[PDB]
Design a protein around this ligand. Structure first.
Ligand SMILES: Nc1nc2c(ncn2[C@@H]2O[C@H](COP(=O)(O)OP(=O)(O)NP(=O)(O)O)[C@@H](O)[C@H]2O)c(=O)[nH]1
Lengths: 133, 126, 136, 37, 430, 176, 23, 192
RNA sequence: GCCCCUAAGCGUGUGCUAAGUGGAAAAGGAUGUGCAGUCGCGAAGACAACCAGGAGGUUGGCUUAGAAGCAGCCACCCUU
RNA sequence: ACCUCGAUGUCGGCUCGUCGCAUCCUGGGGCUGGAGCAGGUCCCAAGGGUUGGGCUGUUCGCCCAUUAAAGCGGCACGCG
């Protein structure tokens, strides 16, 4: 029903989580601690989670790899995306780094080609406006 | 739906068809695109799966001994090429098919001639 | 708004209509143009309205030419009077259009927007017209 | 509903037809349905 | 036919009361209006009298002097700083041998020139012909055009049956016919728009109306606060059709800025009836922004003009006076003492440069605080499952303090009475 | 022509009779009858099928071919499975009550409203807030379903009324 | 108006050949 | 470059005049006249359909081969009298042209490309004159307007001609002008 | 002019019209219909139909309480 | 300027009508910026109805008290 992103470092963020998924009837109190215990080794890196709830609100949390935007921008050090994607340069990235991010994301991707996922991440970067080569 | 691309698709099919020592043709009607990921991860040691358009596969079937599968070119084509021999890949292809139930093996080809589903499954289980 | 700055005679016979245009029948200044299929007396008011229509449709560029000019004088007698006492004073200015003669010319990169502007203009006009272009 | 001698499919959903000898328009939005007369 | 054409101008004015400053300002604004109409000002004559000249608005010797002046300058029109009778018009015409136009006729022709669409054409035509009827004899002797003729009236031997004489055709007969029909539509459009104005009133959305002097930045304030561009400003030396658009206060609460036509000293009442279309906006308005040019050295004249017109309008419907915010625009044009000469008399006015927004922050704060919010101050705590209610608070509500706790979202906000009743259960003071 | 050419299968538990121009079809549910347009010919295939053909390829024949074909198809489907159209009612205080061969709606009117099931159709009720109408003829089933629909005028503002299960009716808003 | 229109239209006929007296 | 002369048939017109010519146009034969240095001209009937087909395929200066009474005759159409209301080809002028004969011909000038975003193109002369042997006449020429900056003038002398082709027309003639795009206010000013 | 009023043809052959058009009318609207001529895709499966594929990269970035694919803005790349 | 000058007697009010619908009310619908009430607009509809007074010669016009409503036009600006 709901899929958001959260960083293992903390829990129960007000705007991102407060009115986001608690609105749909999710046991945030237990879910946040379960997610933290499951993925605390990642420290403060944001990680995507998708919640599957049953009739009785019994919940299961599925984890995916950290966002490709963060993986592309942190290397240069910028912690945010392009305000006007493709219009303002924000960082520089290498083709090897793009392919490594693609291989990491292949779990997130629905894809089965590593080079094609590399193309995926190259698009994901240059559309924001990041030099890729 | 392209015409000039007919020859390109036929050539791309035929090159890998001859490169593969043996090939098996199935219908994959039922599996979400994701399940192909697990299928390829399981068969990556000895075989590779790929989809194709029967409209051109039938035309290309006259190049080699897959002509015996003329009656079998129905449903959504799924070629599971095997690098070498047929058992090495069949032993896993048959088990994955029996598990997921989204694949039905209908034809095969080896030694320049077609072999029946019974032959393919016997090689798989042997 | 177009008005001849001077005219040798200010009270002329009615421009005759019969015949087909022997000149000005080929678009020459722009990509598309408006051709006329029947006679009329296009006046400066209608010409100005059609021009405003085209310019307001395009809104940012292109170029428009008016291959016709209203210069023939036409006079109406004073209101509520009888027959006699000479011709009236010149009130409205018309151009004697004939079938074939091209009226407006337009050059704009976008073919469909150009056609739309030309359609708006032909609607504002009082005559049956059609869009044509340079090619045979 | 509108009744004008000019009927226009004023949006992508609008559909023109000829019913009982009279043209008209239908749309998922009743604001647009109109007849020719 | 029957139009107006100040070809070139030679102003004439009579100083009856007040001061030479008042007389010169009046004649100068008259010249400004004439220039706007297009005539070129050649010279401006002023005659000082204790009371007007009910003969021809000036002395006979002065009229002869003006005839000589006009012949010498080759002028074509004489514009008089006043509203005069047909007899005075005819006297001046026979003294000067040229077309003679007045302030009222000039303003009416300016309106005819400006008006583009809407009911404005009908309003202008009715005002012009209602002003022409009293001067039907004056303008009717200063015909102009006409194509000459001879009488134009000869039926025939009557016998036992008088001429049809059911003349339903006359100068204004149509104007009369027309306006009689078109008043109904004037009211109907008002009412159909009011159908939604009532819903605007249902919400906190208040009505704010700009009351300003003609060509007094009246559209600059709109383009500064609302931001929306206004075609030809929809506000200038003479606009007819008022406009309006939805802006926001200092706090954020929505409202409508209503740009309206400016005013002139003693605007002809024939046009105050067309102004009614924008001057019911003053009664509808929750707030009034009284704008005045900052470069003026005698602001009080225009201030009193606007005040008296608005008083005349309000007296009709006995509506309580709305809040009034005095605004001085184009402030940079004057000196410090130039601003002081206005500030000392009227210190509460806010001086804002619409060209750059200097002080616009204080202007927004003042107007937002003057337009008191029609909300309710409510503190509440709602569980996390009511994220939709928190979203509705964000959308329609007025958040003052939003925080979160395990129990729910502690929100202190100003909210409408319906929603306050809806979520009264979780109120801290339940 | 297209659709009109496709022959109509006749399931095993079916009976057909192509008598003259008229067609009669019987089965477990009941009997039904139909007629055909003169410029369209009908015949019985040797393999349990109904064949419909035309002697020309004109406008009327082309239009009528698919018509007649689907008419026969619906006839044969009715004589075996008939049709059943669902319904449902929204609005607090709204109810439906079965009175045997007739049905009652309480729709907020001053007087509760009675609708009588005509010959060859039955009203079944699963609850006060939902029901169904069943018969052997699609035309009659749909006509009665629409007549039930017409009872309460559409209420976009709140949506209360009788509508089919799958209908997703428009929904505007009122100020207060 | 109808009177005049019909009076004229009587002119287009097989035995008149497009010309009738008085228009 | 070269082109194959297009084969056409042509029957000598039995009788002439307005009536004969318009009856021929009525029944589908466009009348035309073949003249040139080859003595007194002759008058021909050409099939309008295929004639128009070849004309639209190969421009207005295509090279023809008339099977007049079977006798082959190379020719070049010089001009077409075309009605201005219904674009019906009412007359054709054909010029007997022998192999390798140098002729003066009128050739269109196409424009291809686009200027800077704040710019507009304005072609000014469709036809330019050219001298070339009968069989080497291009159907059209092209002028590049890619990446052009600000005010730009392209004249007949600034285009790239084919080989075996000479520019009869004056080289300074302006054929394309690229100018800054008009504004809306400039549009309104136009025609004032 | 030739079905009866009303003298002579409900004449012969080939097609068009559904409007009693015939047996009044404009700008303009439109998917009525016959013919002719074009250009795109098309058994290598054209359009339709049923969809098992149509999922995911991923909040594509900024705006975001918030726009997670479809409150908005920028690119708008990508397999399987 | 076509009939009427060896005569076609004119405005308003009265009596008596009759016809058109381009509908003021009553009746049936569509859309609504149609919560309800009450509105706005358009379509169909001519069966019946459509007040009395003050000023005005008055047509017309303004006002008072009602009313579901106080419709608009043709008939020698119906009818001496
Ligand atoms: N004094 C002053 N006036 C300003 C300022 N900004 C805008 N305006 C007014 O804005 C007007 C802009 O033109 P507009 O209002 O559209 O009408 P207009 O110029 O008066 N037309 P016209 O010349 O015919 O009177 C200027 O004439 C000026 O009156 C400002 O800073 N100071």
């Amino acid at each position: 029903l709901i899929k958001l992103q959260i960083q293992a470092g903390q829990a129960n963020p007000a705007p991102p989580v407060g009115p986001a998924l608690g609105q749909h009837g999710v046991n945030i109190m237990e879910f946040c601690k379960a997610y933290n215990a499951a993925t605390e080794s990642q420290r403060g890196n944001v990680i995507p989670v998708e919640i599957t709830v049953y009739e009785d609100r019994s919940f299961t949390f599925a984890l995916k790899t950290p966002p490709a935007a963060k993986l592309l921008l942190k290397a240069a050090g910028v912690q945010k995306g392009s305000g006007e994607p493709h219009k303002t340069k924000v960082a520089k990235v290498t083709w090897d780094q793009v392919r490594e991010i693609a291989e990491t994301k292949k779990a997130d991707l629905n894809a089965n080609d590593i080079d094609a996922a590399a193309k995926i991440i190259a698009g994901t970067a240059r559309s924001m406006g990041i030099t890729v080569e | 739906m392209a015409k000039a691309d007919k020859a390109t698709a036929v050539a791309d099919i035929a090159e890998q068809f001859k490169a593969s020592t043996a090939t098996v043709v199935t219908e994959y009607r039922g599996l979400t695109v994701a399940n192909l990921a697990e299928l390829r991860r399981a068969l990556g040691d000895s075989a590779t799966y790929t989809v194709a358009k029967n409209t051109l596969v039938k035309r290309a079937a006259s190049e080699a001994g897959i002509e015996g599968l003329d009656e079998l070119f129905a449903g959504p084509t799924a070629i599971a090429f095997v690098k070498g021999e047929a058992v090495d890949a069949a032993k896993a292809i048959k088990k994955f098919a029996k598990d997921n139930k989204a694949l039905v093996i209908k034809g095969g080809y080896m030694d320049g001639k077609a072999l029946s589903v019974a032959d393919v499954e016997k090689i798989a289980d042997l | 708004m177009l008005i001849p700055r001077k005219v040798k005679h200010r009270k002329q016979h009615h421009p005759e209509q019969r015949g087909i245009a022997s000149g000005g029948t080929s678009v020459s200044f722009g990509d598309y143009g408006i051709q006329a299929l029947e006679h009329a007396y296009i006046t400066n008011r209608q010409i100005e309205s059609a021009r405003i229509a085209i310019n307001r449709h395009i809104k940012r560029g292109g170029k428009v030419w008016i291959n016709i000019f209203p210069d023939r004088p036409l006079t109406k007698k004073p209101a509520e009077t009888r027959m006699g006492s000479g011709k009236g004073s010149p009130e409205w200015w018309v151009a004697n259009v004939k079938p074939g003669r091209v009226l407006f010319e337009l050059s704009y990169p976008d073919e469909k927007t150009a056609r739309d502007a030309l359609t708006r203009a032909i609607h504002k006009l009082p005559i049956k017209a059609r869009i044509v272009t340079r090619e045979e | 509903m509108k009744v004008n001698p000019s009927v226009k499919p004023i949006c992508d959903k609008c559909r023109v037809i000829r019913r009982h000898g009279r043209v008209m328009v239908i749309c998922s939005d009743p604001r647009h349905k109109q007849r020719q007369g | 036919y029957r139009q107006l054409r100040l070809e070139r101008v030679v102003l004439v004015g009579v100083w009856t009361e007040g001061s030479a400053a008042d007389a010169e300002a009046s004649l100068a604004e008259l010249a400004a209006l004439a220039e706007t109409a297009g005539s070129e000002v050649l010279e401006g004559l002023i005659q000082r009298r204790d009371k007007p000249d009910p003969s021809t608005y000036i002395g006979s010797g002065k009229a002869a002097e003006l005839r000589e002046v006009v012949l010498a300058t080759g002028a074509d029109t004489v514009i008089c700083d006043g509203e005069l009778s047909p007899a005075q018009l005819n006297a001046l015409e026979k003294a000067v041998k040229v077309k003679v136009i007045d302030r009222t006729a000039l303003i009416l022709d300016i309106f005819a020139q400006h008006a583009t669409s809407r009911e404005g054409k009908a309003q202008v035509s009715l005002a012009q012909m209602e002003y022409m009827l009293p001067r039907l004899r004056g303008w009717g002797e200063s015909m102009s055009r006409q194509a000459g003729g001879r009488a134009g009236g000869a039926g025939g031997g009557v016998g036992t049956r008088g001429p049809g004489e059911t003349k339903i055709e006359t100068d204004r007969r149509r104007i009369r016919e027309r306006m009689a029909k078109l008043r109904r539509e004037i009211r109907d459009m008002k009412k159909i728009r009011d159908t939604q104005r009532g819903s605007r009133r249902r919400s906190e959305i208040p009505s704010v109306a700009i009351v300003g002097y003609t060509n007094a930045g009246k559209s600059s304030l709109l383009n500064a606060l609302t931001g929306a561009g206004v075609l030809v400003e929809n506000a200038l030396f003479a606009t007819l059709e008022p406009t309006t658009r939805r802006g926001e206060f200092e706090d954020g609460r929505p409202f409508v800025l209503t740009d309206t036509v400016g005013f002139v000293r003693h605007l002809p009442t024939q046009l105050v009836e067309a102004f009614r279309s924008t001057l019911e906006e003053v009664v509808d308005a929750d707030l009034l922004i009284h704008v005045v040019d900052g470069s003026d050295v005698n602001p009080l004249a225009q201030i009193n003009a606007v005040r008296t017109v608005i008083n005349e309008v309000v007296a009709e419907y006995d509506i309580a006076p709305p809040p009034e915010l005095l605004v001085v625009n184009k402030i940079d044009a004057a000196t410090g003492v130039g601003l002081a000469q206005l500030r000392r008399a009227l210190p509460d006015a806010v001086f804002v440069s619409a060209r750059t927004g200097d002080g616009l922050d204080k202007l927004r704060s003042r107007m937002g605080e003057l337009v008191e919010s029609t909300d309710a101050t409510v503190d509440v705590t709602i569980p996390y499952d009511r994220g939709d209610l928190v979203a509705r608070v964000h959308t329609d509500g007025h958040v003052d303090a939003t925080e979160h706790t395990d129990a729910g979202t502690r929100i202190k906000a100003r909210v409408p009475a319906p929603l306050a009743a809806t979520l009264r259960e979780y109120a801290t003071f339940a | 022509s297209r659709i009109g050419k496709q022959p109509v299968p006749v399931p095993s538990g079916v009976d057909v009779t192509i008598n003259g121009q008229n067609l009669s079809v019987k089965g477990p549910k009941g009997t039904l009858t139909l007629d055909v347009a003169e410029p369209i010919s009908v015949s019985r295939a040797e393999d349990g099928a109904i064949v419909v053909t035309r002697p020309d390829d004109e406008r009327r024949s082309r239009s009528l071919h698919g018509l007649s074909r689907t008419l026969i198809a619906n006839l044969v489907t009715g004589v075996t499975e008939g049709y059943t159209q669902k319904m449902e009612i929204f609005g607090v205080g709204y109810r439906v009550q079965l009175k045997g061969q007739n049905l009652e709606f309480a729709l907020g009117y001053s007087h509760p409203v009675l609708i009588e099931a005509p010959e060859g159709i039955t009203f079944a009720v699963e609850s006060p807030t939902k029901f169904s109408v069943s018969g052997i003829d699609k035309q009659k089933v749909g006509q009665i379903s629409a007549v039930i629909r017409r009872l309460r005028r559409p209420d976009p503002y709140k949506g209360k009324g009788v509508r089919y299960e799958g209908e997703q009716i428009r929904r505007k808003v009122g100020k207060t | 108006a109808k009177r005049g229109r019909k009076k004229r239209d009587r002119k287009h006929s097989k035995a008149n050949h497009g010309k009738r007296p008085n228009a | 470059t070269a082109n194959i002369p297009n084969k056409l048939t042509a029957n000598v017109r039995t009788r002439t005049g307005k009536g004969a010519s318009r009856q021929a146009r009525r029944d589908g034969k466009v009348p035309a006249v073949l003249y040139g240095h080859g003595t007194d001209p002759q008058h021909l009937e050409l099939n309008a359909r295929d004639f128009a087909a070849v004309l639209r395929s190969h421009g207005t200066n295509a090279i023809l081969t008339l099977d007049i009474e079977g006798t082959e005759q190379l020719a070049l159409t010089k001009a077409l009298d075309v009605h201005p209301i219904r674009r019906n080809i009412q007359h054709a002028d054909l010029l007997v042209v022998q192999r390798g004969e140098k002729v003066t011909v009128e050739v269109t000038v196409l424009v291809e490309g686009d200027a800077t975003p704040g710019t507009l193109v304005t072609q000014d002369a469709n036809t330019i004159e050219i001298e070339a042997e009968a069989l080497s006449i291009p159907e059209q020429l092209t002028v590049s307007v890619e990446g052009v900056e600000a005010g730009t003038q392209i004249t007949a002398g600034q285009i790239s001609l084919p080989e075996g082709v000479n520019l009869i027309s004056d080289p300074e003639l302006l054929v394309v002008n690229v100018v800054e795009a008009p504004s809306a206010e400039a549009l309104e000013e136009e025609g004032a």
